[PDB]
C-alpha cells in the first residue's frame, strides 16, 4: 500500500529536480522495481488460505529488496540522495 | 628593570603572531587604496539591494574585480589600480542612477532565507556556490573577499552571525519561514510578483545544490572543525601531534619547551577543554570546551604589561641605522 | 591600555563562571547579561575595527577568541531551550512522509497536542484547523483500526467546542442580492467526513503535506516553547513540491467575480505597464494634462492591487483607463498612435467576456453549492443525536 506510492512521489521530485538540474535518468530504475512488485502481489493476494512455496517467493521478495537497497544507494551517489535516503529510511525501519 | 616590567599573563604572543598573520598592506599608500576599496565596495551594496533579477551577471563580475583588486593590493602596486578604481566608480555610478529611474523599488523577500543558505555554507570550499548566491543577499562583499582568497585564521562564519542569530544553522528555522513566506506570497502587489517569483525558481536551484551541506550533523561539524584549530595550538606550542601521542606525554613534555606559570593554563582551561571535546555529544558539552578554549587564549596571547612582536623588528632597524651613522663618522 | 580595560570589565573568569554555573543551574535572566557581553564585545570590537586603520595582524586573531567566546554562550542558550521543551513535536510534523505512514508515531503526537486543544479559547478558529487534518489521515491510511480511537476523541473534543458556544448565543450577484466563517470551517469539516467512507483513493503524499503547509505555519508562529530539532532528509521533498505547487500557481491554467485567475492579471500588467511607459515619455512632448495623470495613476494604481481581486473590478478600471486614453489619442497627433496598444486591450476586454460569460451560462451548480453549505450546522446535530446514545 505504501510503497508504490512513495516511488511515484519521489518521481514527482525528480522530475522537479530535472527542471533545475542535470538528473532525470534514476527513474527508468523505479518503474522496473515498481512492475516486479506485481509480480509477487499477484501470488500473495492469489491466496485464499496458505502455501508452502509462498516461503520461497518471500525469500526472492526479501533479497530482492535487499538488491533494491544497493541500487538505490548506487543512484545516490551522483545524484540528489535526500529523496533516496527517505525511502531507504523507511525500508530499513520497515524490514 | 625586569622587576617592574615583568608580566604574568601572555607570553607566547608572539608564537601567534608568527604563525596566524595574513598578508597584509605593507605600506600606507597601499592601505589608503585598501580604505578606498572598502569604503567604495560598502556604497556598492546600496546599489546591490536595488537591482533585478536579470542584473546578476555584471554583479558576478563586479565581486571578482575586488577580488582582482585586493589581491594586486598586496602586490603592492599601486599604478593601474586607482586607474580602474574609476571604472568601477563610473559603472557602479551608472548604475546607482538608473536605481533612481526605477518606478517599481525592488524590495527584497527570502533575504532572510537566502543569508541563512550563505550562513550554512559559509566555508572557503564551495564559495562558487557563496558567489552564486550572494546577489540576492544582504552580505558585505568585503567578507566573500576573504574566501575565494583566504585571509582568515579562524572559522569565518562567526563574521555573520552577530548583528545589530547562532540558532538557524542548529534548526530549521530556516525552512519553517518558507512556509510562511510560501503562503504569504499572495495579497501583495503585482509589482512584487515578477520579481518575487523569479526569487522562488533560483531559491530551488539554490537549495538542491546545497542540500548536502545541511544534512552534516552540525553539531558533530564544529566539534571536528574545534579539534582541527585545537590540535594545531599544541603542535605549536610543543611540537609534534596529539593524532599521534598520549595526554601525558605531552603534559611533562611543555616543560621540555615551556615555562612553568603558562603551562598552567596549558592544564588548566586547554587539555580538559579538549577531554571535553573528545566526550562531546550534547551541545552544552561543545559550549563548555568551546568557552574554556576562549578563555584559554586570552592568556597567551595578553601580556599584563604592553607587549607588541611587530614593534622588535621595528626597533632593531633603527639600531642597525644608529651605529652604521657614527661608524660612517668615524 | 583599551585591551587591559576590556577584559578588566566585563571577560574576567571570575565574572565567565558566574555564567557558566547560570547556565548550568537553570538560573534567571542569564540569557540578557549575555547580550550586555555581545553589545560590549561589539562596542570593542567596532572601536578597533574602525580604530587604527593599520594592523590586523592581531586584532583578527584576538576577534576570532571573543566570537567564539559568545558561540559557547549562544550553544548552551540553544540547550536551555530544549530545558523547556513543553511540546515534544516540532512543525514540519505532518510535513515529511515518514512521520505519516507510522501510525504509532502521528499517534504518539496526538497525546503530546492534547493540551493545546483544551488550551486557547473559544472563537480561536486556528485549533480547529488541525483537527481537520488528522481526519483525512484516517483515509490515508485506508480505515487502520488502531487510529479509531483519535478519529472518534477528535470529533468528540470539536463537538464540545461547538457545543460550549450555543451555550453562549442563548445568553455583484450577492452584492446585488443584499441590496433587495465558521460556515466555511464546518463544511470542511463534514466532506472530510464524508469522504473517508468513498471506495478508495490510491493515496498520494503530495496532496497531504500541502495542508501540512497549512498546519505547520499555524503550528510554528501561535504556539511556542516546542521541541527543537535538526533539519531531516525527508522534509525537503515538502517544501520544494510545495513551492513548485505555488510556482505554478501564477503560471498553470471554473469561476468568474470571485476568482481571480492570475494568467490574465499578468497579462493586464504587462499590456499596461507598456502604456505607462509609453505615456511617461509622451508626457515629456507635452509636459502636463490631468488626462493623462489621471490615467497614469489608475494605470498605477491598478498595478498597486492586490492578486487575489476578482475581476470586475479590474474589468471596470480597465475600461476607465481605456476611454481616457482613447479621448487622448483621439485628441493628440498621429505621430502617437497607440492603436496597437487599444487593440490588444480591446481584444483582452472581449475574451474577458466570455469567462464572465460562463458563469452565467451553468449558474446553478454555484447555487447548489450554497445549499451545500449548510452541511456545518447538520453534522453536529445528527452525532449529537446518534453518537451520543452508546457514549
Given at each position: 500500500k505504501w510503497l508504490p506510492s512513495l516511488l511515484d512521489y519521489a518521481a514527482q521530485t525528480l522530475s522537479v529536480i530535472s527542471k533545475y538540474s542535470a538528473t532525470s535518468e534514476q527513474q527508468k530504475i523505479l518503474l522496473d522495481a515498481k512492475s516486479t512488485l506485481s509480480s509477487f502481489f499477484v501470488h500473495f493476494n492469489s491466496s485464499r488460505i496458505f502455501d508452502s512455496s509462498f516461503i520461497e517467493s518471500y525469500s526472492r521478495f526479501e533479497l530482492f529488496i535487499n538488491e533494491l537497497l544497493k541500487k538505490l544507494e548506487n543512484a545516490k551517489e551522483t545524484g540528489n540522495a535526500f529523496v533516496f535516503d527517505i525511502i531507504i529510511e523507511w525500508i530499513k525501519a520497515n524490514k | 628593570f625586569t622587576d617592574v616590567l615583568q608580566l604574568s599573563r601572555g607570553h607566547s604572543i608572539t608564537l601567534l603572531w608568527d604563525i596566524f598573520r595574513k598578508n597584509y598592506p605593507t605600506t600606507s599608500n597601499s592601505w589608503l587604496a585598501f580604505e578606498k576599496l572598502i569604503n567604495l565596495s560598502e556604497k556598492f551594496d546600496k546599489v546591490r539591494l536595488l537591482q533585478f533579477s536579470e542584473s546578476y551577471?555584471?554583479?558576478?563580475?563586479?565581486?571578482?574585480?575586488?577580488?582582482?583588486?585586493?589581491?594586486?593590493?598586496?602586490?603592492?602596486?599601486?599604478?593601474?589600480?586607482?586607474?580602474?578604481?574609476?571604472?568601477?566608480?563610473?559603472?557602479?555610478?551608472?548604475?546607482?542612477?538608473?536605481?533612481?529611474?526605477?518606478?517599481?523599488?525592488?524590495?527584497?523577500?527570502?533575504?532572510?532565507?537566502?543569508?541563512?543558505?550563505?550562513?550554512?555554507?559559509?566555508?572557503?570550499?564551495?564559495?562558487?556556490?557563496?558567489?552564486?548566491?550572494?546577489?540576492?543577499?544582504?552580505?558585505?562583499?568585503?567578507?566573500?573577499?576573504?574566501?575565494?582568497?583566504?585571509?582568515?585564521?579562524?572559522?569565518?562564519?562567526?563574521?555573520?552571525?552577530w548583528t545589530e542569530f547562532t540558532s538557524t544553522i542548529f534548526s530549521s528555522q530556516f525552512l519553517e519561514d518558507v512556509v510562511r513566506k510560501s503562503n504569504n506570497l499572495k495579497s501583495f502587489s503585482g509589482n512584487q510578483i515578477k520579481q518575487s517569483i523569479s526569487d522562488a525558481e533560483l531559491l530551488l536551484s539554490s537549495t538542491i545544490k546545497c542540500s548536502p551541506n545541511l544534512l552534516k550533523s552540525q553539531m558533530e561539524y564544529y566539534k571536528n572543525m574545534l579539534l582541527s584549530w585545537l590540535r594545531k595550538v599544541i603542535d605549536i606550542h610543543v611540537g609534534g601531534d596529539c593524532l599521534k601521542l598520549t595526554l601525558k606525554e605531552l603534559c611533562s613534555l611543555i616543560e621540555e619547551k615551556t615555562a612553568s606559570e603558562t603551562r598552567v593554563t596549558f592544564a588548566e582551561y586547554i587539555f580538559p577543554a579538549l577531554d571535553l571535546a573528545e566526550s562531546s555529544k550534547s551541545l552544552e558539552e561543545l559550549g563548555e570546551a568551546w568557552i574554556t578554549f576562549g578563555t584559554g587564549l586570552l592568556l597567551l596571547f595578553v601580556p599584563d604589561s604592553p607587549y607588541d612582536p611587530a614593534i622588535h623588528d621595528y626597533v632593531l632597524y633603527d639600531l642597525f641605522l644608529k651605529t652604521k651613522t657614527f661608524s660612517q663618522n668615524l | 591600555d583599551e585591551w587591559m580595560a576590556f577584559l578588566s570589565s566585563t571577560m574576567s573568569s571570575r565574572q565567565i563562571k558566574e555564567l557558566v554555573s547560570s547556565y548550568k543551574c537553570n538560573s534567571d535572566q542569564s540569557d540578557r547579561r549575555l547580550e550586555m557581553l555581545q553589545q560590549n564585545s561589539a562596542h570593542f570590537l567596532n572601536r578597533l575595527e574602525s580604530g587604527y586603520s593599520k594592523f590586523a595582524d592581531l586584532n583578527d586573531i584576538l576577534a576570532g577568541y571573543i566570537y567564539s567566546i559568545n558561540f559557547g554562550f549562544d550553544l548552551?542558550?540553544?540547550?536551555?531551550?530544549?530545558?523547556?521543551?513543553?511540546?515534544?513535536?516540532?512543525?514540519?510534523?505532518?510535513?515529511?512522509?515518514?512521520?505519516?505512514?507510522?501510525?504509532?508515531?502521528?499517534?504518539?503526537?496526538?497525546?503530546?497536542?492534547?493540551?493545546?486543544?483544551?488550551?486557547?479559547?473559544?472563537?480561536?478558529?486556528?485549533?480547529?484547523?488541525?483537527?481537520?487534518?488528522?481526519?483525512?489521515?484516517?483515509?490515508?491510511?485506508?480505515?487502520?483500526?488502531?487510529?479509531?480511537?483519535?478519529?472518534?476523541?477528535?470529533?468528540?473534543?470539536?463537538?464540545?467546542?461547538?457545543?460550549?458556544?450555543?451555550?453562549?448565543?442563548?445568553?455583484?450577484?450577492?452584492?446585488?442580492?443584499?441590496?433587495?466563517?465558521?460556515?466555511?470551517?464546518?463544511f470542511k469539516l463534514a466532506d472530510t467526513y464524508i469522504s473517508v467512507f468513498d471506495k478508495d483513493h490510491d493515496a498520494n503524499f503530495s496532496s497531504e503535506l500541502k495542508s501540512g503547509a497549512?498546519?505547520?505555519?499555524?503550528?510554528?508562529?501561535?504556539?511556542?516553547?516546542?521541541?527543537?530539532?535538526?533539519?531531516?532528509?525527508?522534509?525537503?521533498?515538502?517544501?520544494?513540491?510545495?513551492?513548485?505547487?505555488?510556482?505554478?500557481?501564477?503560471?498553470?491554467?471554473?469561476?468568474?467575480?470571485?476568482?481571480?485567475?492570475?494568467?490574465?492579471?499578468?497579462?493586464?500588467?504587462?499590456?499596461?505597464?507598456?502604456?505607462?511607459?509609453?505615456?511617461?515619455?509622451?508626457?515629456?512632448?507635452?509636459?502636463?494634462?490631468?488626462?493623462?495623470?489621471?490615467?497614469?495613476?489608475?494605470?498605477?494604481?491598478?498595478?498597486?492591487?492586490?492578486?487575489?481581486?476578482?475581476?470586475?473590478?479590474?474589468?471596470?478600471?480597465?475600461?476607465?483607463?481605456?476611454?481616457?486614453?482613447?479621448?487622448?489619442?483621439?485628441?493628440?497627433?498621429?505621430?502617437?498612435?497607440?492603436?496597437?496598444?487599444?487593440?490588444?486591450?480591446?481584444?483582452?476586454?472581449?475574451?474577458?467576456?466570455?469567462?464572465?460569460?460562463?458563469?452565467?451560462?451553468?449558474?446553478?451548480?454555484?447555487?447548489?453549492?450554497?445549499?451545500?453549505?449548510?452541511?456545518?450546522?447538520?453534522?453536529?446535530?445528527?452525532?449529537?443525536?446518534?453518537?451520543?446514545?452508546?457514549?
Open positions: - | 551577471n555584471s554583479i558576478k563580475d563586479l565581486m571578482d574585480v575586488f577580488r582582482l583588486l585586493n589581491d594586486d593590493v598586496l602586490n603592492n602596486k599601486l599604478s593601474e589600480f586607482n586607474l580602474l578604481l574609476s571604472k568601477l566608480e563610473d559603472g557602479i555610478n551608472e548604475l546607482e542612477l538608473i536605481s533612481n529611474k526605477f518606478l517599481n523599488k525592488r524590495k527584497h523577500y527570502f533575504a532572510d532565507e537566502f543569508d541563512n543558505l550563505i550562513r550554512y555554507t559559509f566555508s572557503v570550499d564551495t564559495a562558487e556556490l557563496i558567489k552564486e548566491l550572494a546577489p540576492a543577499s544582504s552580505l558585505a562583499t568585503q567578507k566573500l573577499t576573504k574566501l575565494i582568497t583566504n585571509k582568515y585564521n579562524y572559522p569565518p562564519i562567526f563574521d555573520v552571525l | 548552551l542558550k540553544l540547550q536551555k531551550s530544549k530545558d523547556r521543551a513543553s511540546f515534544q513535536i516540532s512543525p514540519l510534523w505532518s510535513m515529511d512522509p515518514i512521520n505519516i505512514s507510522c501510525a504509532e508515531n502521528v499517534l504518539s503526537a496526538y497525546h503530546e497536542l492534547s493540551r493545546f486543544f483544551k488550551k486557547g479559547d473559544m472563537e480561536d478558529t486556528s485549533i480547529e484547523k488541525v483537527l481537520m487534518y488528522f481526519l483525512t489521515l484516517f483515509k490515508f491510511h485506508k480505515r487502520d483500526t488502531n487510529l479509531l480511537e483519535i478519529f472518534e476523541a477528535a470529533l468528540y473534543t470539536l463537538y464540545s467546542r461547538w457545543s460550549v458556544r450555543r451555550f453562549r448565543q442563548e445568553q455583484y450577484e450577492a452584492d446585488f442580492r443584499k441590496l433587495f466563517n465558521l460556515d466555511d470551517i464546518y497549512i498546519i505547520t505555519t499555524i503550528l510554528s508562529e501561535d504556539l511556542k516553547n516546542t521541541r527543537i530539532e535538526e533539519l531531516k532528509s525527508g522534509s525537503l521533498s515538502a517544501v520544494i513540491n510545495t513551492l513548485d505547487a505555488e510556482t505554478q500557481s501564477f503560471k498553470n491554467t471554473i469561476d468568474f467575480y470571485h476568482d481571480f485567475s492570475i494568467p490574465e492579471f499578468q497579462k493586464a500588467g504587462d499590456i499596461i505597464e507598456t502604456v505607462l511607459k509609453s505615456v511617461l515619455k509622451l508626457l515629456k512632448q507635452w509636459p502636463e494634462h490631468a488626462t493623462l495623470k489621471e490615467l497614469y495613476r489608475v494605470s498605477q494604481e491598478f498595478l498597486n492591487y492586490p492578486i487575489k481581486t476578482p475581476l470586475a473590478r479590474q474589468l471596470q478600471k480597465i475600461e476607465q483607463i481605456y476611454t481616457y486614453l482613447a479621448e487622448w489619442e483621439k485628441y493628440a497627433s498621429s505621430e502617437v498612435s497607440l492603436n496597437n496598444t487599444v487593440k490588444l486591450i480591446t481584444d483582452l476586454i472581449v475574451s474577458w467576456r466570455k469567462l464572465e460569460l460562463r458563469t452565467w451560462k451553468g449558474l446553478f451548480n454555484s447555487e447548489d453549492a450554497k445549499t451545500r453549505k449548510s452541511i456545518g450546522k447538520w453534522w453536529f446535530y445528527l452525532y449529537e443525536s446518534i453518537v451520543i446514545s452508546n457514549f
